[PDB]
Write a protein that binds this ligand. Structure first.
Ligand SMILES: C[C@H]1O[C@H](O[C@H]2[C@H](O)[C@@H](O)[C@@H](O[C@H]3[C@H](O)[C@@H](O)[C@@H](O)O[C@@H]3CO)O[C@@H]2CO)[C@H](O)[C@@H](O)[C@@H]1N[C@H]1C=C(CO)[C@@H](O)[C@H](O)[C@H]1O
Ligand SMILES: C[C@H]1O[C@H](O[C@H]2[C@H](O)[C@@H](O)[C@@H](O[C@H]3[C@H](O)[C@@H](O)[C@@H](O)O[C@@H]3CO)O[C@@H]2CO)[C@H](O)[C@@H](O)[C@@H]1N[C@H]1C=C(CO)[C@@H](O)[C@H](O)[C@H]1O
Lengths: 517, 522
């Protein structure tokens, strides 16, 4: 019996999952072809990255129409077949809600640009006069998350430069004014539209966004990484009224809809407010995702996640915004794989839910050596090449050792929207499926054993002392040990007699073992 | 008795005709279910687009094995039953010969890739070292017909980028070296294999292909559509020795086998050499197909076709590579339908044979609005999304008004528009004024009154937008213009047989009328 509390969710980055028509862009027809593989892995749900009409300047997170599928991804009819088939395989379906900003191509923003200062069209966004004698300075000192000014100046009807608009991310992603009532009205309709098609819930992009301080005050810390968190730009009290309204909307359905927030705030007190019983069901536990390979750092991040997350956090070790775990833990392919295997086996034993990013079950490394001309992330161009960006974790997946695109399609290599390295076939899904010791087989074994032997009602009971290189805990009749160090480890007899259930490779170095007690 | 001279051939694009097993792909069981309808319409033969084993990167024209049926379409024994049933209905069967190139999945090409430079395996294809200091430039400046370079570089077994191979069409369609003796031997066997199963003849794909100039010279005209005809890439003298060989094989059967070439050459004089008595029986009269709706242009194309075809050319107004007639002539449904009805009625009165592309008898338009994710034609990707391609004339046919796929199945490999149900065959069959009923009436009347060898006799001039001729006692007038046309008394008293529009002597605008002389009236 399905429970969001314990769900294992497969994150589908549709552009790079599977390409059914051979134009190099992953699509809904390709996801249909691969749903069997996701269900056979043992997942409970899928989360689709944004597949709405988008000019792709931020690869789907710049949305030009929230009620339509992008034609490069398919049709509404193909979408409905994805949902029907996913449901038939026992999978729930989460879509991505991107309501902090839209594409500059969106009809509302085209209207704002064509209207005059102070118009209702501009009042749905954040337009301000510039500073300086000719308005040539930005209205405040905020940085775009992607680098540069968070403001872009527009041209007015008489052809002169005029007001600026705010964009927390790319220049082509203007931020909504969430104090304008039409904004909330539009997005309640977006929720109801997709829920009517059987979508089971939403992952909320930039859940710490939407509302800014009404004064848009300068960040007193300056610009750049050492300025610290910009308290006026994020995480405002009004956002909890928003999430109370969305939760009430989703709770009208049977079963109730599900919301998981993408929240990046420094304070655990601020994070916990998003998780009150009448707001969001969960939020990603990012503390663990950002830790290096270190027993003390892992345990502290786990303790932090359990204490705010009311006992059942949404764990994740990778997503479409960060380097793949094999690369993060390699500091070396052999070392990164061993640690990624142990980390996957540890996180899938934690109480709560787990989000698996496509390709992590294959142990793919990050592709850091892309040619300059191949990169497409706005971070790459906005930083003048000083920040690589995220393309290395978005490479089209290998499905078979054979084929010019390794089974991502039947097409030529030059079609794929990002290039696959010639060695990607070494990580092919079909190869790993035939190998019981593969990363794919480890994930299959983990999900089967987790379902058989663990219950979400069993909390962690720590067995190891704080500070040790060996992390150990009990849940119910299962004992989990992760040896982060270089020395083998014999569990002490006081923990009880142990019978092994699985292992990511005595507890050998850099290995996770599940045992029955 | 049947004659190839005036056969009406139904072109079956199998993937989009009818789906009998519910996977969204047309198949042989679906064709079997529709043979009765083709014969009832009034056709004398079918031509099947390629249905051999193929990965479908060019939807059957990239063949992986020439002695097979693709498993998605059925088995060899199901094909045999289709041929028997077609023959039992009086239909002859043409298959598609695709001998300029094969799929890169073909065993010979897999063997070529696995072998070394200079091997016999590569000698059956056209592998060359690249130009430039590191071989990074293609061996010459030729274009693929679908867009981009006509060459693809391979990786050699030591991992270095190495030789390039030539492909006139997609990268996955390597061209044979027709100077290698094993190629001719292979295709003589292909002919005998299918002829032994009762196939009556072949439509020859890229009949201006096969042989290239042996030096593979750069095209001095450059690249792209303004470069002009690439004389070194096509239409070489050795291709006529090839067709003399195939015709000599076909002439030993009783009745002799039939060859119709798909020939695209810049000059109609160049077409004639392919039609000499020891070569191909016919070639599509593409000059008429490319003309806009205009009386002068149509007449000149018909005169040219009759001359090249020795009086009995193979007419066609559409196929699986061009926009459907309703769209070409409308380019606007009502005007396109009116003109397509008038054009079908004119073309079916010309001396010779006629090829009807499936769906043109329903008056289907081109489906130009497909989403990017639905496009499958290699032209789409190879043009970087700048050329639409051919998928819009390959949409699965509507059979019934009802049903999620309009009776094509019971998702389709290409999506049908919501409005396709308006064109359903069963709806048109019950409507005497439908495009389908017009084709049925045209074919019945053609068989009764245009069954002889009477040539065209052009009638006297009467204005710029009128085309008119007589064959024996049958008079045909097509009014291309916007005004009604009253024929002159000098042509004689005319009794109407049929018209492309539903009681006067005047020919209404954009209409073709067939009439008879000497009926004792007025
Ligand atoms: C794209 C993303 O930007 C913001 O989030 C954070 C970045 O994802 C991280 O790079 C973060 O840095 C931490 C590292 O991840 C971690 O490994 C460690 O080194 O600590 C770092 C601390 O500097 O920095 C950003 C904030 O701290 C933003 O909050 C988040 O919402 C964004 N993700 C979504 C937003 C957009 C715009 O629609 C999309 O482009 C993304 O794909 C979404 O997933
Ligand atoms: C697919 C087809 O390509 C070749 O023929 C095409 C010409 O190369 C094009 O230029 C175009 O001709 C047009 C003229 O440019 C224009 O001035 C006007 O006269 O209209 C013409 C027709 O629209 O279109 C031609 C037809 O598409 C090639 O010569 C021909 O053999 C090709 N057809 C077969 C070949 C293959 C490859 O095996 C298949 O993909 C096709 O389905 C076959 O039918």
């Amino acid at each position: 019996a399905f429970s969001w509390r314990d769900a294992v969710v497969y994150q589908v980055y549709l552009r790079s999952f599977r390409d059914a028509n051979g134009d190099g862009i992953g699509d809904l027809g390709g996801l249909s072809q691969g749903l069997d593989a996701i269900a056979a892995l043992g997942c409970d749900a899928i989360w689709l990255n944004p597949c709405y009409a988008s000019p792709q300047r931020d690869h789907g997170y710049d949305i030009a129409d929230y009620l339509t599928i992008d034609p490069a991804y398919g049709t509404l009819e193909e979408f409905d077949e994805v949902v029907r088939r996913a449901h038939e395989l026992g999978l729930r379906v989460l879509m991505d809600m991107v309501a902090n900003h839209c594409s500059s191509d969106h009809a509302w923003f085209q209207a704002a640009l064509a209207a005059e200062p102070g118009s209702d069209e501009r009042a749905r966004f954040i337009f301000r006069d510039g500073l300086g004698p000719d308005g040539e300075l930005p209205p405040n000192n905020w940085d775009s998350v992607f680098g540069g000014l968070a403001w872009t100046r527009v041209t007015e009807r008489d052809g002169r430069p005029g007001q600026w608009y705010l964009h927390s991310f790319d220049t082509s992603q203007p931020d909504f004014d969430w104090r304008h009532p039409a904004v909330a009205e539009h997005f309640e309709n977006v929720l109801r539209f997709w829920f009517e098609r059987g979508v089971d819930g939403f992952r909320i992009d930039v859940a710490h966004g939407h509302f800014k301080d009404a004064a848009l005050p300068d960040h007193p810390g300056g610009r750049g990484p050492d300025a610290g968190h910009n308290h006026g730009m994020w995480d405002q009290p009004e956002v909890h009224d928003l999430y109370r309204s969305w939760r009430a909307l989703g709770d009208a359905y049977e079963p109730e809809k599900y919301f998981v927030g993408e929240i990046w705030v420094p304070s655990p007190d601020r994070l916990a407010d998003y998780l009150r019983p009448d707001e969001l069901h969960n939020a990603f536990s990012f503390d663990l995702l950002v830790q290096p390979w270190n027993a003390d750092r892992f345990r502290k991040a786990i303790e932090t996640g359990l204490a705010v997350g009311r006992g059942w956090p949404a764990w994740t070790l990778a997503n479409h915004d960060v380097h793949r775990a094999v690369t993060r833990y390699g500091q070396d392919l052999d070392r990164g794989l061993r640690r990624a295997r142990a980390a996957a086996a540890l996180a899938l034993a934690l109480p709560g839910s787990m989000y698996l990013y496509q390709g992590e079950e294959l142990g793919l490394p990050e592709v850091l050596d892309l040619p300059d001309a191949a990169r497409q992330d706005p971070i790459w161009t906005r930083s003048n090449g000083t920040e690589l960006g995220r393309d290395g974790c978005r490479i089209p997946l290998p499905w078979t050792r054979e084929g010019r695109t390794f089974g991502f399609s039947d097409a030529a290599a030059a079609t794929t929207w990002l290039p696959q390295p010639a060695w990607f076939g070494a990580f092919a899904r079909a190869t790993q499926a035939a190998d019981p010791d593969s990363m794919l087989s480890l994930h299959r074994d983990l999900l089967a054993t987790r379902r058989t032997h663990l219950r979400g009602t069993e909390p962690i009971v720590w067995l190891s002392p704080a500070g040790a290189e060996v992390l150990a805990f009990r849940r119910g009749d299962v004992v989990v040990v992760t040896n982060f160090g270089s020395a083998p480890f014999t569990p002490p007899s006081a923990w009880g007699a142990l019978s092994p259930l699985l292992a990511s490779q005595t507890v050998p170095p850099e290995t996770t073992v599940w045992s029955r007690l």
